[PDB]
Amino acid sequence: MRHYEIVFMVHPDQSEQVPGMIERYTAAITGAEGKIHRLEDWGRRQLAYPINKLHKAHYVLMNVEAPQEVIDELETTFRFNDAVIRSMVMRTKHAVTEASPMVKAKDERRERRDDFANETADDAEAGDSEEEEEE
Amino acid sequence: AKAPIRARKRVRKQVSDGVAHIHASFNNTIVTITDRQGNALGWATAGGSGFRGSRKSTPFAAQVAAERCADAVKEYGIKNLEVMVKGPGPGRESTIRALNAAGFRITNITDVTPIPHNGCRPPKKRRV
Amino acid sequence: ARYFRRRKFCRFTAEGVQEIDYKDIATLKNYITESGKIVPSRITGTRAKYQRQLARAIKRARYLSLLPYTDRHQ
Amino acid sequence: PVIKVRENEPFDVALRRFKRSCEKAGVLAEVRRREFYEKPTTERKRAKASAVKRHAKKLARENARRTRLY
Amino acid sequence: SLSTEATAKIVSEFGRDANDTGSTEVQVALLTAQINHLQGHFAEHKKDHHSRRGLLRMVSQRRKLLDYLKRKDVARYTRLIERLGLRR
Amino acid sequence: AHIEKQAGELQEKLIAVNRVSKTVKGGRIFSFTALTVVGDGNGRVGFGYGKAREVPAAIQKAMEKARRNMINVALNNGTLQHPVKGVHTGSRVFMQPASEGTGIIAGGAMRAVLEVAGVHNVLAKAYGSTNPINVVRATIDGLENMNSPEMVAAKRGKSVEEILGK
Amino acid sequence: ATVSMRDMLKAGVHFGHQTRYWNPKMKPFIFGARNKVHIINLEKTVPMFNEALAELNKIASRKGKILFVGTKRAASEAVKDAALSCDQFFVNHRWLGGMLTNWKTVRQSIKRLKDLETQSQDGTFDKLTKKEALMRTRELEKLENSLGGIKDMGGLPDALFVIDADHEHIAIKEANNLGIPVFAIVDTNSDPDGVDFVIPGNDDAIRAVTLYLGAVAATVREGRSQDLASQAEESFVEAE
RNA sequence: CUUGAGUCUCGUAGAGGGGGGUAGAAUUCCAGGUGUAGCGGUGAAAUGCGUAGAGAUCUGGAGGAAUACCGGUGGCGAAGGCGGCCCCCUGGACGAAGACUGACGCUCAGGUGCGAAAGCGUGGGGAGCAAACAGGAUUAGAUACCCUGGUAGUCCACGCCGUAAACGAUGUCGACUUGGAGGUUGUGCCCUUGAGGCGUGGCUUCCGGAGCUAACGCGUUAAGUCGACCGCCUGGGGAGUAC
RNA sequence: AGGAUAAGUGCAUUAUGUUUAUGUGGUGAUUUGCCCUUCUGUAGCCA
């Protein structure tokens, strides 16, 4: 129907849950006559302050179009998930279906802000493997 | 409002360095030295020789507080210093100058002043 | 000279782009002090459009800890 | 308020009188104000009111030259 | 809110079937769809008085257009008013 | 030192008298203030408030100010050709057309102000503030709403005012 | 005639004068703001001055006793400079009131003034306290500099030439009270109403104050060729 | 008919309404570690808290109101009214082109509908502050002034008669009357050159002209020029009470 | 590694600029309140 730009972040120690869930979420969206207009994972970062303990988190920009009843239920699920810690959703008017240039800011994350471990393989399993899937 | 300057008297750490925490208000200063592992090697305050009224928060009562606490942590065998600052209150500068004049380094003057979100109601029984 | 819009540094004390989206971090800092925190619009004469939309867009980012929230995170 | 970074023409004491502007700017710049939801527009938020006196001070610098007091 | 597929259905069922949304019958039936939409909100809670001002706008105007309409032709009026239901 | 206007006739209408006080700063001095009206016989906007040490020097000051920055104005016959309601600063006064068979009808200093103004037969009731200082504006505002005769036919009456500049 | 508006396509500016909102009633004859301040141009004054340049022709036909009054920080020399001619009198120090309305007292004080001036300049002003005499001399000089306009002139002038509005409020204030027609130079912080003749312009410098009010123009110089059959037969030398 | 008003898709601003979601930090507390005497309050002050180890500080848990600075003279709601940030459901306004209807208009006795706040029934909840009540300080006292403990209250939601400074202070709504600029916003145009300028609308505010006031003040949002139609006043006190 | 527009080095107690007791009612300065004009006129009032 209309586009509601979900961006969300992931706890390190829990990261192994997300590669399975996102693909199930893409199947919930497209199974409701919406589209995924992006799904870019940004990598692992240092947070500006702790959120639910630990100083680092992992970033995913999902960018939904979907019927309005369902997008309210995915954002609530993602903020209350057992691996995603927080999410923020912004409005359809005077805004994009695909966001601003974060293209550099993604690489910077992968290059230098990364731990290089299993938890950061999962980030790449969660955005740079698909943009839409049926589960 | 001063800790033990004399030797063997209380438990020592002798780690060459510490961090100080300064709580600056318009009515007091609390200057408290701690270990880099996070344990108090001494404190003082600005009513440590009896300043009261406005005079309790001013640069000169802020300075003597800093001079009482800085003295003691030389028997806990510290030589170097770092500072955390918390409030736009007075003597916030006179206190830094006092730590450095006490024979310590003060290169990192880290503002970490907390933010209340104004969850309380302040005392009023009047027109203003 | 016609349809050379944003060819150059024009408007602002410092030229970031967008004000409502917050997904990039490196073009919002243009309007953020060192304490980790929003520029005070009275003192600066901020460009009002960009400032009004940055008031929601910085909070959304803050709550997603993309930026500091409070001075103790300096 | 002392700020982590240093002022221009710098010395080993950091101070807020040179490179601060948004710190305690409504958090403790308040005096006995209670919890309010519309009273600040006329009590607290005097920006139009306070801008005039500053404008008057920039106005008087021209006007002293124009009378030739200098 | 009011959307393209409700609005098209209304033009299809009410007034002329193309290129008209402005006439008395269909104008009343477009207002009806927003009153229904407002009653959709008013099936979550009932301390909705700041919106109720608006409900009474959309009714008051139906009273204005039903008045005009019944002074033009009693057919469009008696059909419309029964075909858009409302009240017991 | 200014041009003055004159009338070939004397008016010395003293309307008010007052005294100036500072009460501690140099204490209180003997000075008076005064208001005096200078007409023409057909009217003037002439009103003068002045001040000096004593009452005579004070009135003569005030009589001078009643004839500088002022000009005379004129009206034919002892009536006014418009029923209008003159207002000046809360002192509001009324007029309606009348006969010559009535002259003045008024009291105090007002009967003396209206005689020079030419609006004494038309004299109808005053309302709002009617103490001396402002009641006396008859010959000022009541001659700025003025109408005065110049036609030979009532149906040429609006046509005749148009061609006076066209 | 046309030369006076051949020079207004050549100067007319000040690039603003005061405030963001300026004086609204002069807005038609003048250019609006640019980049967070106020700017003015010479361009918006020429359509106004395409007929209105005929009023410099009406103050040159009856020319004998003209007074250039209202001095400012950069306008003072321009009040001296447009009035440099020998029928035309000027001040160089700020004007104050009563110099036209209590003219009685002023003419009694001129009559004192030229006597104590011949005395001071001959050296005849001496006292056994030198301080009391030199201090009277400094203050006598200020009178000479302030009054120099009406001082050497036969009586109240036939026009009054106000160059400034912005601080010299009084010179316009008294001209309305003596009824003497006004010849005005208005700026973008002053209205063109309430004065009888205008140059649209600015109040400072030689941009409007002698660029039409001098020998370079043709309209202050064709008024004066109409004096030569009315009160005189030859007088065109005197005036600029 | 359009010269009034109404309506569709398109776009845009905002704390409107109803219901969901969510983080960090001061006061406060507990615990353990480290650590010793004032801490607090204010005009200055004492009462208060504290050696049963207070104040402060490191680590980790507790909890509820609350959410800066951005935030402005902004904007929204019917007026009072709305303030952390976000979404769902939905209102009402702001712009623009295509398109339609075509006086469907104006006001409003009666009328029904409808709350900032506390008052107030029940449910939720309590860290701080507080009428009362105590005690201090002040003094002719001291209920005012000022502080300290401390409770209902504050704090949430609906609900009962909706109180007020419940306001474009200015009824309702509209037509007409030199502008410029601020705040901040649709959108055409710019070196997009800094909350800007010009083009054309927007609410919203400074400044001042024609006209108006008793003065402040108003001035294109009128307190101007007026329009229709409704409300209300006839000296004060005593009375927004009585009846 | 975006706590890096680095203060836009545009910054200054940052929006209540506050608090340590009071002392009754009226009262000074005038009996010519008068020294500007023809006709249409004036201050007790006139050409």
Swiss-Prot record, chain A:
CDD domains given in the database record: bS6 (cd00473)
N6-acetyllysine modified-residue sites: K93
Post-translational changes noted in the entry: 5 different forms of the protein, varying only in the number of C-terminal glutamate residues, were isolated. The sequence shown is form bS6-6, which is the longest. The first two Glu are encoded by the rpsF gene, the other Glu are added post-translationally by the RimK enzyme.
SUPFAM superfamilies reported in the protein's UniProt record: Ribosomal protein S6 (SSF54995)
Paired cysteines (S-S): none
Record-level GO cellular component terms: cytoplasm; cytosol; cytosolic small ribosomal subunit
A Pfam short name: Ribosomal_S6
GO biological process, one term: cytoplasmic translation
Acidic residues bias: start-end ranges: 120-135
NCBIfam families on file: S6
Record's function text: Binds together with bS18 to 16S ribosomal RNA.
Family from the record: Belongs to the bacterial ribosomal protein bS6 family.
Name of protein: Small ribosomal subunit protein bS6
Organism per entry: Escherichia coli (strain K12)
UniProtKB/Swiss-Prot annotation, chain E:
Subunit field text: Part of the 30S ribosomal subunit. Forms a bridge to the 50S subunit in the 70S ribosome, contacting the 23S rRNA.
GO molecular function: rRNA binding; structural constituent of ribosome
Membrane among keywords: no
Family: Belongs to the universal ribosomal protein uS15 family.
HAMAP family tied to this protein: Ribosomal_uS15_B
Role description: One of the primary rRNA binding proteins, it binds directly to 16S rRNA where it helps nucleate assembly of the platform of the 30S subunit by binding and bridging several RNA helices of the 16S rRNA. Forms an intersubunit bridge (bridge B4) with the 23S rRNA of the 50S subunit in the ribosome.
InterPro entries with a match to the protein in the record: Ribosomal_uS15 (IPR000589), Ribosomal_uS15_bac-type (IPR005290), uS15_NS1_RNA-bd_sf (IPR009068)
Residue ranges the record marks as coiled coil: none
Ribonucleoprotein as UniProt keyword: yes
Species, as recorded: Escherichia coli O157:H7
Protein's UniProt name: Small ribosomal subunit protein uS15
Gene Ontology biological process terms from the UniProt entry: translation
GO terms under cellular component: cytosolic small ribosomal subunit
PROSITE patterns per record: RIBOSOMAL_S15 (PS00362)
Keywords from the named record: Ribonucleoprotein, Ribosomal protein, RNA-binding, rRNA-binding
Organism classification: Bacteria, Pseudomonadati, Pseudomonadota, Gammaproteobacteria, Enterobacterales
One Pfam family matching this protein: Ribosomal_S15
From Swiss-Prot, chain F:
GO molecular function: rRNA binding; structural constituent of ribosome
Transmembrane residue ranges: none
GO biological process, alphabetically ordered: cytoplasmic translation; maintenance of translational fidelity; response to antibiotic; ribosomal small subunit assembly; translation
Stated consequence of mutating R111G: In strain: NEA-314; neamycin resistant
Keywords, sorted A to Z: Acetylation, Antibiotic resistance, Ribonucleoprotein, Ribosomal protein, RNA-binding, rRNA-binding
Effect of S21P: In strain: SPCR13 and SPCR15; spectinomycin resistant. Not a ram mutation
N-acetylalanine modified-residue sites: A1
Record SUPFAM superfamilies: dsRNA-binding domain-like, Ribosomal protein S5 domain 2-like
Pfam family, one: Ribosomal_S5
Sequence ranges assigned to domain S5 DRBM in this UniProt record: 10-73
Cellular component GO terms held in the UniProt record: cytoplasm; cytosol; cytosolic small ribosomal subunit
Protein origin, superkingdom: Bacteria
Domain notes: The N-terminal domain interacts with the head of the 30S subunit; the C-terminal domain interacts with the body and contacts protein uS4. The interaction surface between uS4 and uS5 is involved in control of translational fidelity.
Sequence similarity: Belongs to the universal ribosomal protein uS5 family.
Function: With uS4 and uS12 plays an important role in translational accuracy. Many suppressors of streptomycin-dependent mutants of protein uS12 are found in this protein, some but not all of which decrease translational accuracy (ram, ribosomal ambiguity mutations).
Remaining remarks: Altered uS5 proteins have been identified in a number of mutants. Some mutations in uS5 have been shown to increase translational error frequencies.
Gene name linked to the record: rpsE
From Swiss-Prot, chain G:
Modified residues (N6-succinyllysine): K114
Key words, A-Z: Ribonucleoprotein, Ribosomal protein
InterPro entries: Ribosomal_uS2, Ribosomal_uS2_bac/mit/plastid, Ribosomal_uS2_CS, Ribosomal_uS2_flav_dom_sf
UniProt xrefs under SUPFAM superfamilies: Ribosomal protein S2 (SSF52313)
GO BP terms, alphabetized: cytoplasmic translation; ribosomal small subunit assembly
GO cellular component: cytoplasm; cytosolic small ribosomal subunit
Gene3D superfamilies in the cross-refs: Glucose-6-phosphate isomerase like protein, domain 1 (3.40.50.10490), Helix hairpin bin (1.10.287.610)
Superkingdom of this protein's organism: Bacteria
One of the record's GO molecular function terms: structural constituent of ribosome
A Pfam family this chain is assigned to: Ribosomal_S2
Entries under PROSITE patterns matching the protein: RIBOSOMAL_S2_1, RIBOSOMAL_S2_2
Complex formation: Part of the 30S ribosomal subunit, contacts bS1. Some nascent polypeptide chains are able to cross-link to this protein in situ. In collided ribosomes contacts ribosome rescue factor SmrB.
Free-text function comment from the UniProt entry: Required for ribosomal protein bS1 (rpsA) to bind to the 30S subunit.
Family classification: Belongs to the universal ribosomal protein uS2 family.
Name of the molecule in the record: Small ribosomal subunit protein uS2
Organism of origin: Escherichia coli (strain K12)
Organism placement in taxonomy: Bacteria, Pseudomonadati, Pseudomonadota, Gammaproteobacteria, Enterobacterales
Annotated gene: rpsB
